[PDB]
Design a binder for these strands. Structure first.
Ligand SMILES: [Mg+2]
Ligand SMILES: [Mg+2]
Ligand SMILES: [Mg+2]
Ligand SMILES: [Mg+2]
Ligand SMILES: [Mg+2]
Ligand SMILES: [Mg+2]
Ligand SMILES: [Mg+2]
Ligand SMILES: [Mg+2]
Ligand SMILES: [Mg+2]
Ligand SMILES: [Mg+2]
Ligand SMILES: [Mg+2]
Ligand SMILES: [Mg+2]
Ligand SMILES: [Mg+2]
Ligand SMILES: [Mg+2]
Ligand SMILES: [Mg+2]
Ligand SMILES: [Mg+2]
Ligand SMILES: [Mg+2]
Ligand SMILES: [Mg+2]
Ligand SMILES: [Mg+2]
Ligand SMILES: [Mg+2]
Ligand SMILES: [Mg+2]
Ligand SMILES: [Mg+2]
Ligand SMILES: [Mg+2]
Ligand SMILES: [Mg+2]
Ligand SMILES: [Mg+2]
Lengths: 109, 153, 148, 195, 50, 129
RNA sequence: AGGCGGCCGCCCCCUCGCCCGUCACGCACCGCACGUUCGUGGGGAACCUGGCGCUAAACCAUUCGUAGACGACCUGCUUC
RNA sequence: AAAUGGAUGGCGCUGGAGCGUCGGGCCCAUACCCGGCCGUCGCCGGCCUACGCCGCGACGAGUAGGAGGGCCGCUGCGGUGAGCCUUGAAGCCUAGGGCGCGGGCCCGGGUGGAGCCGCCGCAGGUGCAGAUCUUGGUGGUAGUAGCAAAUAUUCAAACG
């Protein structure tokens, strides 16, 4: 029992003032608010948990309604502690202001 | 002949049609949308109330410049009109559907009108006499009427 | 509005005000409410409402109506009006109101002669009229086409 | 989840910037005591700017067009509207997440009010510069509800005074218990492992 | 422009929403203020123009 | 699990939209085939951002993955038995596709000869009793 | 812009309701994710069961004029 | 001091989110470097459709205009496929499968009932979004305007 993943809020895509680049997304991760603080999270792996009414899940025991697009941390972003991430599939753009899990594996503890 | 929206079975269903009959397509569509989804005796009483101007027919789609009435509040609508000739023709075709159900041998007291359909017949052209010796067409708009009735269980 | 307390003896003119079709209505208004006024155990849950009325409210208004039986009218419906008591403290205003529930209020009691009292009502409807009759603008002369 | 912010001694633009940034992330933030939000500059200057803003209105139909609120909560809500992209379905959802209240509501009496340090008058303004109260501005122009709000505010401040004596009595009792004996065995371990 | 004969405007801007009132009994928009010095009385009665 | 041909890599197309024609949505007289606009004011020819993209040489697929079905073969159309038997040498990369005007009486013989010669046919179970 | 908390008289149980120590077990599913949550999460139509209760109101029609272009508004209709 | 109500873009900003001097970071364009793929060009390889097959390197924007290619397309002509079929050709529809960047094409399913296509050469009345384009049909308007110049009709019966 207990949560193992660190909380991170989806913020938006990599973009300029006018245009966007949907291949790389931005994550405001909680606790980190500095360039020196967004160093431990380099190499973490992210997951966006959402719901659909069809019965497509992991083989972990029971069939449910949970669908997850996987991905991982690429690099840091700015001085405020925001973190870039490239997922395996691009974001649905409904996740703005919503939470993406950051799990504590392959990092180097 | 073929009908759109074929029923569940031809045993418990009767059918009727009128072809090339001088009415207005808009009036017959707007009264068919009020007939559709109703018991046959309620529809007969409804059309007799239309001919007696006691219960109206709301114009929901073809509602351009149509005056209001007080009787439309049963339908949740503001406008309304009382089509006498459309009520007469559609009551005649409901009597035809009743006779066809009697020929097929159904429980004639418990029919409901599941499907009704109206579409434009080929119209006949007349002419007006406007200003400056010009001729503008004066054309009708007849329609073909189809109805599929079903027993209620 | 905090809460509204209605009296026990509610007139048929007030019931005709609350209903729309008095012929089609079965005259069933306020039956359980008068039963709550009649029951002794309901009074303990009703006198607490006045004690909360003394504590929290400042503006107390009195709903009264007219007697249509004394009038030569044909309407037979009594018009309800909230009348803000501008007296003293809320406690004696509530005591005055509960003392004069189900009672008549003459005009000679409150209003007097030589008094300057304003009148509020609804104007005479003249119908869907035009501009020179509504806004009283100046007419156009005889030579004007498409309207004077 | 939910955030409850004080409005006493805060600046309008700074607090609106921090609220409009934190409401796009999803944290349901609510600014309470909105009448106490200070605005820098002279008060005649601020009401002259607001009088010009009231003068801004459509000549053809004043209703269909510029709406001008007088309540300070709705002033702050218009300030956050002018900063969020409200014409799209991101800022509209952010404004639906944002709630603003004048005075203090009864759930926000109980729930603890946060104070943002970077939006403070004391942090951002030199104390020899002029300022203006948004509640004073609202009472001067349009918002006729200071006599009710200030009365209920003094009532809940009396409620806070009658709660704080009980809380301080309980704190004195628990520090008398900490002064008492037979707790120090765990306290040696706590001090040697970061009391 | 320069209308050269300025006239007082017809009508009033204050009475401009000339909609039918949803009520026929003319309700009271504002009652006079109260004080504990004055004795207890009522303010508004009903009547019929005869 | 039918024939499982030789080593064919991951097939990419660099875009899969079969580019729409400008203002084909607005007018239903315009078929959705591409046609290069040669106007002097057109945003598509001027290549403004936020518009449709014109087909040019950059969208050309790889020569290894050109004319490649997702199964891993290259299709070749066939009318009869001799045009099926011409694929006897290269059946492990080239599949057959029976023409539409071939009846069932000869279609069953063509698919029987393909099953004997181990030649993949794209539509084996069509137009049968 | 209120529904959870505090006190007293009793209630069927619990002196392991928690930390320190000994002992033996429960799937150890044999390298793999979407796991544990305020969830007896929100809404709609029905299914079988116990107790306590409810027995109407709008719209049309008709009439009305204090009202109306049409709608709309104010009204009447008890067998005395 | 200027007429609609409005403009550092707005919101706001005073220990700055103003002004002038600057330090360290941070963000991106089709710009630059590396890499994958297509094409053009230059050089070149081999006695493997030589009009084919490979290899290296540099570059690809563009109205008027000019060339090359098209195993893009339509119609008909001569060779040609022991071509296709009334166990279903042309045409048409299609939330189907796919190819080619593209012109377009092939197959699946349905109506249809008698002619059709691939390659090589040949010849065109050979490809449409416009021309207040020609012919034909159909919508919004729209059940809208309008059925109002010349005083006026009413009761009963009858055929129906
Ligand atoms: Mg209209
Ligand atoms: Mg009209
Ligand atoms: Mg004429
Ligand atoms: Mg003539
Ligand atoms: Mg009148
Ligand atoms: Mg004239
Ligand atoms: Mg008022
Ligand atoms: Mg130009
Ligand atoms: Mg400004
Ligand atoms: Mg500076
Ligand atoms: Mg070029
Ligand atoms: Mg024939
Ligand atoms: Mg061809
Ligand atoms: Mg030609
Ligand atoms: Mg020719
Ligand atoms: Mg054309
Ligand atoms: Mg053109
Ligand atoms: Mg034309
Ligand atoms: Mg024409
Ligand atoms: Mg013809
Ligand atoms: Mg037309
Ligand atoms: Mg008309
Ligand atoms: Mg005439
Ligand atoms: Mg007769
Ligand atoms: Mg007769």
């Amino acid at each position: 029992s207990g949560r193992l993943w660190s909380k991170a809020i989806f913020a938006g895509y990599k973009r300029g003032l006018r245009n966007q680049r949907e291949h790389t997304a931005l994550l405001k991760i909680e606790g980190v608010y500095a360039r020196d603080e967004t160093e431990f999270y380099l190499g973490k792996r992210c997951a966006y948990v959402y719901k659909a009414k069809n019965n497509t899940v992991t083989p972990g025991g029971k069939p449910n309604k949970t669908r997850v697009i996987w991905g991982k941390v690429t690099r840091a972003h700015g001085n405020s502690g925001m973190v870039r991430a490239k997922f395996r599939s691009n974001l649905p753009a409904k996740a703005i202001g919503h939470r993406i899990r950051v799990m504590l594996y392959p990092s180097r503890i | 002949v073929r009908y759109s929206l074929d029923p569940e079975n031809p045993t418990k269903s009767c059918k009727s049609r009128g072809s090339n009959l001088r009415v207005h397509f808009k009036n017959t569509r707007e009264t068919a949308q009020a007939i559709k989804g109703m018991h046959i005796r309620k529809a007969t009483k409804y059309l007799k109330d239309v001919t007696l101007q006691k219960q109206c027919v709301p114009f929901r789609r073809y509602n351009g410049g149509v005056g209001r009435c007080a009787q439309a509040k049963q339908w949740g609508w503001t406008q309304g009109r009382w089509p006498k000739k459309s009520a007469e023709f559609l009551l005649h075709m409901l009597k035809n559907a009743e006779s066809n159900a009697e020929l097929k041998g159904l429980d004639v007291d418990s029919l409901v009108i599941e499907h009704i359909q109206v579409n434009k017949a080929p119209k006949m052209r007349r002419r007006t006499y406007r200003a400056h010796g010009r001729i503008n067409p004066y054309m009708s708009s007849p329609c073909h009427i189809e109805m599929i009735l079903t027993e209620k269980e | 509005t905090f809460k509204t307390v209605f009296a026990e003896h509610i007139s048929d003119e007030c019931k005709r005000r609350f209903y729309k079709n008095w012929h089609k209505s079965k005259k069933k208004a306020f039956t359980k409410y008068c039963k709550k006024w009649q029951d002794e155990d309901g009074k303990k849950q009703l006198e607490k409402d006045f004690s909360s009325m003394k504590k929290y409210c400042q503006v107390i208004r009195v709903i009264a109506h007219t007697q249509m039986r004394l009038l030569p009218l044909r309407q037979k419906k009594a018009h309800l009006m909230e009348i803000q008591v501008n007296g003293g403290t809320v406690a004696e205003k509530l005591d005055w109101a509960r003392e004069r529930l189900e009672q008549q209020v003459p005009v000679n009691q409150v209003f007097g002669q030589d008094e300057m009292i304003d009148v509020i009502g609804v104007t005479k409807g003249k119908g869907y009229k035009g501009v020179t009759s509504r806004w009283h603008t100046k007419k156009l002369p005889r030579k004007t086409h498409r309207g004077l | 989840q939910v955030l409850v912010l004080d409005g006493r001694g805060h600046l309008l633009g700074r607090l609106a910037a921090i609220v409009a940034k934190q409401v796009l992330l999803g944290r349901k933030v609510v600014v309470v005591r909105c009448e106490g939000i200070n605005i820098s500059g002279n008060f005649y200057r601020n009401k002259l700017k607001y009088l010009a803003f009231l003068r801004k209105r459509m000549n053809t139909n004043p209703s269909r067009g510029p709406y001008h609120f007088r309540a300070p909560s709705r002033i702050f809500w218009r300030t956050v509207r002018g900063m969020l992209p409200h014409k799209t379905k991101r800022g509209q959802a952010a404004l639906d997440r944002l709630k603003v209240f004048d005075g203090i509501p009864p759930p926000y009496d109980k729930k603890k009010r946060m104070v943002v340090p970077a939006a403070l008058k004391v942090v951002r303004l030199k104390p020899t510069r002029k300022f203006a109260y948004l509640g004073r501005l609202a009472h001067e122009v349009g918002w006729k509800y200071q006599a009710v709000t200030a009365t209920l505010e003094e009532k809940r401040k009396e409620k806070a005074k009658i709660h704080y004596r009980k809380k301080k009595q309980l704190m004195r009792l628990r520090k008398q218990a900490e002064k008492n004996v037979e707790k120090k065995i765990d306290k040696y371990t706590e001090v040697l492992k970061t009391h | 422009s320069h209308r050269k004969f300025s006239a007082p405007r017809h009508g009033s801007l204050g009475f401009l929403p000339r909609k039918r009132s949803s009520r026929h009994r003319g309700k009271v928009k504002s009652f006079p203020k109260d004080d504990p010095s004055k004795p207890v009385h009522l303010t508004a009665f009903l009547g019929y123009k005869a | 699990a039918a024939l499982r041909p030789l080593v064919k890599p991951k097939i990419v197309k660099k875009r899969t939209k079969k580019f729409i024609r400008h203002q084909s949505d607005r007018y239903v007289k315009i078929k959705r085939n591409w046609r290069k606009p040669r106007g002097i004011d057109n945003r598509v020819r001027r290549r403004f951002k936020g518009q449709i993209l014109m087909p040019n040489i950059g969208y050309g697929s790889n020569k290894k993955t050109k004319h490649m079905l997702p199964s891993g073969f290259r299709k070749f159309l066939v009318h009869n038995v001799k045009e099926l038997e011409v694929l006897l040498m290269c059946n492990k990369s080239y599949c057959a596709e029976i023409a539409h005007n071939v009846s069932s009486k000869n279609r069953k013989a063509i698919v029987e000869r393909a099953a004997q010669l181990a030649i993949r046919v794209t539509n084996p179970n069509a137009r049968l009793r």
